[PDB]
């Protein structure tokens, strides 16, 4: 008895219905309320300057053409009928390649409340477009936007909203971080207006705020360069007569800084300016360069070729520029570390 | 109200033919085009192309769709576009392109009372370039986008940039990570063939490559390794292991820089301008250890059969030679 009335309601919905045109095309603006549930904020590619996110994307809008009367108050349609009802063309302004899933059935729900207010809760996967300012690599933070609006319809035709308080509408799942590089602090929900060539559009916005973890770069990139510079300054406490030892030392510490430089620049998008890591590596490379130049200035003033014996003709003294550089270079490197780590942990 | 609008759409699309050109026997239809570039995603020097996301919009006045009695512009659902006429426009530079499909497929049909119809498409296309990478990384590229009608000739269809020099917008929004856009030009022309003259448009760019990054990564350490090669000149000839360790560890470091810039840079197997600079620096570092071979064979070999002359001469010759090399390089390419 109930299924008979149900199939009669299903048959007599779409009689005289037209899915080509907006509900109230001359009457009112069509208010569409929107809810988002992020199940995973997937992995953020720095080379492509993009990110991946998975959402359940709930919509709701009142359609006068789909009132009904029956036993129940709420319906649940096929996608065969959800392709036969007007549905607002919500595209994503920064989408690169996005997928509406259909395993196993198409992931589309359409509820009809008995007043005619639809509820259309589909499940997506969004490969978005977050432009990154990388002056402060890797000690930086930036916002990544998720921005949707209607495509064909203007502000005069379709106006979007949120289903709740706006900061509570976009809900990230608790186990839905799914990042290794960055660290999601929180979202910021907003609403805005574009001026395209075709008219003003209501454009929603969710920002996602991301700070990069820096422990990997302190272990891999910063500390080996620091210890290499510490070695290049250390060599001064070898004696002035051991020319091949300090020579091999200086040139191969420059080779070590070369290896660290190229391996640190490899794992990074090829931006066209000076990242903070590039400043650090270049100045450390300059220190290891200046150490070997200082040893050359030591070697030019040697006058002798043999070592001081362990018991006592003349001998060499420790050169004065050795005693100068032993105080000079670690002080300059410590001053540069204070300036660097005080400048770039502040922004 | 709404019933009149529904009856109006039903009688506009009553008996419509989706194969007739507008004014099928009369004049050619004018299609005015319009692009809002969202972004340029990647510029791949390996694959010689670029990925271009835009809003490709068209205008043509179709007198089979002119309504009356309604003041508002009829913006229909995008699924009426399978029931209309559209131009057969394609992209000559294209490799692989797609109208986006989330959440529904991105079209718009915005009708007008005289019969003008807007046709919008959010297209992420991939357009090819022929790249002159012989001056890499000091090049200026010229990447285009070539739009052409497919079946209709210019007797049937006409393409113009709607607005002259201000059709294509949003190029100033583009912030490429390694390029910098000098200039975009807009070209409209009919292309004479043997089969018939076809219309063509041409969006184009110019991409000046940004060069301070390679000063950071690639040029500066080769310069400093080249200068550290010279340190053997201010060492006594008796210290053999020091000058040999200098020259040998220096050519080893140049080998590592050349190999990991063979691996780091985009891989395009012909002669570039960073390759000439790195190989020239490798030649200078090689000559600066041929110098020690020259010194050791003259003193310790041709002794019984000057050293400060050769060293004092090389200390003046090699910086002048390397500065002349930098002069020739950075004025011949720039």
């Amino acid at each position, epitope marked *: 008895d109930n299924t008979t009335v149900f199939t009669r309601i299903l048959d007599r919905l779409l009689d005289g219905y037209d899915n080509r045109l907006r509900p109230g095309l001359g009457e009112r603006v069509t208010e569409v309320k929107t809810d988002i549930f992020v199940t995973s904020f997937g992995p953020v590619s720095d080379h492509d300057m993009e990110y991946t996110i998975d959402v359940f994307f709930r919509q709701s809008w009142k359609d006068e053409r789909l009132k009904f009367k029956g036993p129940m108050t709420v319906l649940r349609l096929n996608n065969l009928m959800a392709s036969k009802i007007w549905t607002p063309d919500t595209f994503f302004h920064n989408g690169k390649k996005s997928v509406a899933h259909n395993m196993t059935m198409p992931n589309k729900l359409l509820r009809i409340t008995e007043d005619g207010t639809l509820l259309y809760t589909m499940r997506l996967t969004v490969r978005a477009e977050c432009p990154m300012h990388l002056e402060d690599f890797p000690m930086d*933070a930036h916002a990544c936007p998720l921005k949707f609006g209607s495509y064909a319809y203007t502000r005069a035709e379709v106006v979007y909203e949120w289903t709740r308080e706006p900061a509570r509408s976009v809900v990230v799942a608790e186990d839905g971080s799914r990042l290794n590089q960055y660290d999601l602090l929180g979202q*910021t929900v907003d609403s805005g207006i574009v001026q395209s060539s075709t008219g003003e559009y209501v454009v929603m*916005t969710t920002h996602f705020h991301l700070k990069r973890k820096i422990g990997y770069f302190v272990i891999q990139t910063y500390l080996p360069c620091i210890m290499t510079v510490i070695l290049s300054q250390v060599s001064f406490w070898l004696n002035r007569e051991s020319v091949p030892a300090r020579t091999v030392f200086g040139v191969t510490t420059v080779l070590t800084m070369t290896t660290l430089s190229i391996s640190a620049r490899n794992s990074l998008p090829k931006v066209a300016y000076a990242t903070a890591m590039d400043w650090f590596i270049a100045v450390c490379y300059a220190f290891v360069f200046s150490a070997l130049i200082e040893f050359a200035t030591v070697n030019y003033f040697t006058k002798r070729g043999y070592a001081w014996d362990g018991k006592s003709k003349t001998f060499n003294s420790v050169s004065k520029i050795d005693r100068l550089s032993r105080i000079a270079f670690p002080l300059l490197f410590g001053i540069f570390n204070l300036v660097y780590w005080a400048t770039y942990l502040n922004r | 109200n709404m019933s009149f609008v529904k009856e109006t759409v039903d009688k506009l699309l009553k008996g419509y033919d989706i194969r007739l050109r507008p004014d099928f026997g009369g004049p050619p239809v004018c299609v005015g085009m319009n692009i809002d570039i969202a972004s340029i995603d990647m510029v791949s020097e390996v694959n010689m192309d670029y990925t271009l996301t835009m809003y490709f919009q068209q205008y043509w006045r179709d007198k089979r769709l002119a309504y009356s009695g309604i003041p508002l512009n009829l913006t229909l659902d995008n699924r009426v576009a399978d029931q209309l006429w559209v131009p057969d426009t394609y992209f000559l530079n294209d490799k692989k392109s797609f109208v986006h499909g989330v959440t529904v497929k991105n079209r718009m049909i915005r009708l007008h009372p005289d019969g003008t119809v807007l046709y919008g498409l959010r297209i992420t296309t991939t357009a090819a370039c022929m790249m002159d990478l012989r001056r890499y990384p000091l090049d200026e590229q010229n990447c285009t986008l070539e739009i052409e009608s497919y079946g209709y000739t210019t007797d049937d269809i006409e393409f113009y940039w709607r607005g002259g020099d201000k059709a294509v917008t949003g190029v100033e929004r583009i912030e490429l990570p390694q390029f910098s856009i000098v200039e975009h030009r807009l070209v409209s022309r009919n292309v004479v063939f043997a089969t018939g003259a076809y219309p063509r448009l041409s969006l184009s760019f110019r991409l000046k490559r940004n060069i301070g990054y390679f000063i950071l990564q690639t040029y500066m350490p080769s310069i400093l390794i080249t200068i550290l090669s010279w340190v053997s000149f201010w060492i006594n000839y008796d210290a053999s292991a020091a000058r040999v360790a200098l020259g040998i560890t220096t050519v080893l470091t140049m080998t590592t820089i050349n190999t990991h810039l063979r691996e780091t840079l985009p891989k395009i197997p012909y002669v570039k301008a960073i390759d000439m600079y790195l190989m020239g620096c490798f030649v200078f570092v090689f000559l600066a250890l041929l110098e020690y071979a020259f010194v050791n064979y003259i003193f310790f070999g041709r002794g019984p059969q000057d050293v400060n002359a050769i060293d004092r001469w090389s200390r003046i010759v090699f910086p002048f030679t390397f500065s002349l090399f930098n002069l020739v390089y950075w004025l011949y390419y720039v």
Partner: nanobody
Amino acid sequence: GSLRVSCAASGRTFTTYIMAWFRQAPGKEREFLAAMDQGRIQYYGDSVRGRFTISRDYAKNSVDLQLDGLRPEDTAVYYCAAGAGFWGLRTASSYHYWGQGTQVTVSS
């Protein structure tokens, strides 16, 4: 009446940066007015929504606030701002570049 207040920039290409206008009455309160994104999106303050209009010239690197229908209570200093707003678009601790501030005095 009407007013048009611009804000030129130099030293940096701000094409990718969210530029804004603020307002500070005597009372030490930096109120958000308007902001245009890199993707041309106008965000507006809540108290001033629909009255004013923000626009940018992305080539000449400037932001332009068009003033419209001025109350006498629109009497304050107008602060140009730029940034890449982090916990942003409404909060003064997101913008890291600032204008010199311009007094606008309106009475009846």
